[PDB]
C-alpha cells in the first residue's frame, strides 16, 4: 500500500516526455476536425494525408511555444499553477491580439 507524495510523478512525466519525439494528438479526431472546419469555406474538398500531417506538426509546435511563454509569466507572478489570464497576457504582449 504505497502512494507517492504528489509532484514526483509529474516531474518524471516531464522528463519522459521531453526525452522522446512523437505525436501527442490522435489522428482520427484531428482529421475530422480539419474536415469539419474546412467544410464551411468550400463544399466537397478532398484532402491528402501529408497535408493533415503538416497541419498537425504546425499546431503542436505553436501550442508548445505558447505554454513555455505562459509558464514564464506564471513563475514571474510568484505562483505555480497556470491561469488563463496568463495566456491572455502572453498573447497580448506578443502582438497577436
Amino acid at each position: 500500500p504505497h502512494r507517492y507524495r504528489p509532484g514526483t510523478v509529474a516531474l518524471r512525466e516531464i522528463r519522459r516526455y521531453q526525452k522522446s519525439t512523437e505525436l501527442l494528438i490522435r489522428k482520427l479526431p484531428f482529421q475530422r476536425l480539419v474536415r469539419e472546419i474546412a467544410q464551411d469555406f468550400k463544399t466537397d474538398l478532398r484532402f491528402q494525408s501529408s497535408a493533415v500531417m503538416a497541419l498537425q506538426e504546425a499546431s503542436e509546435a505553436y501550442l508548445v511555444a505558447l505554454f513555455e511563454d505562459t509558464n514564464l509569466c506564471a513563475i514571474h507572478a510568484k505562483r505555480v499553477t497556470i491561469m488563463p489570464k496568463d495566456i491572455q497576457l502572453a498573447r497580448r504582449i506578443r502582438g497577436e491580439r
Partner: protein
Amino acid sequence: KAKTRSSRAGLQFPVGRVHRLLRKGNYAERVGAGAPVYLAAVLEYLTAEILELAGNAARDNKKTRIIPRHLQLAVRNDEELNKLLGRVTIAQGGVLPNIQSVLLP
C-alpha cells in the same frame, strides 16, 4: 574541355543550376558571372556547419544515422543559428529538457 565550373572553382554545390534559378526567377534584368559561384560557396559553408554540429549528438546518442531529434538538438543548442532560424517548426522535432527553478522541492 568539359571543365565543369564546380571543378574550376573546387566546390561541391553546382553552379549551372544556381545560374538557371537566378535567370528563371526574374530577380533583376542582368546577372553577373561571379554571383552564383559566391552563392554556392555560402550555401556550402552553411550546410557544412549544420552537419558538423549534428555529428556530435549523432555519436553521443550511440547512433550511426542522423535523425530529426539530432537536427533539432544541433540547431537549438547553438546561439547564432538559433537567431538565424528564428521561428521554424521541425516535424518530429521535440523540445529541450528544461525544468524551471522553483518546481523542484
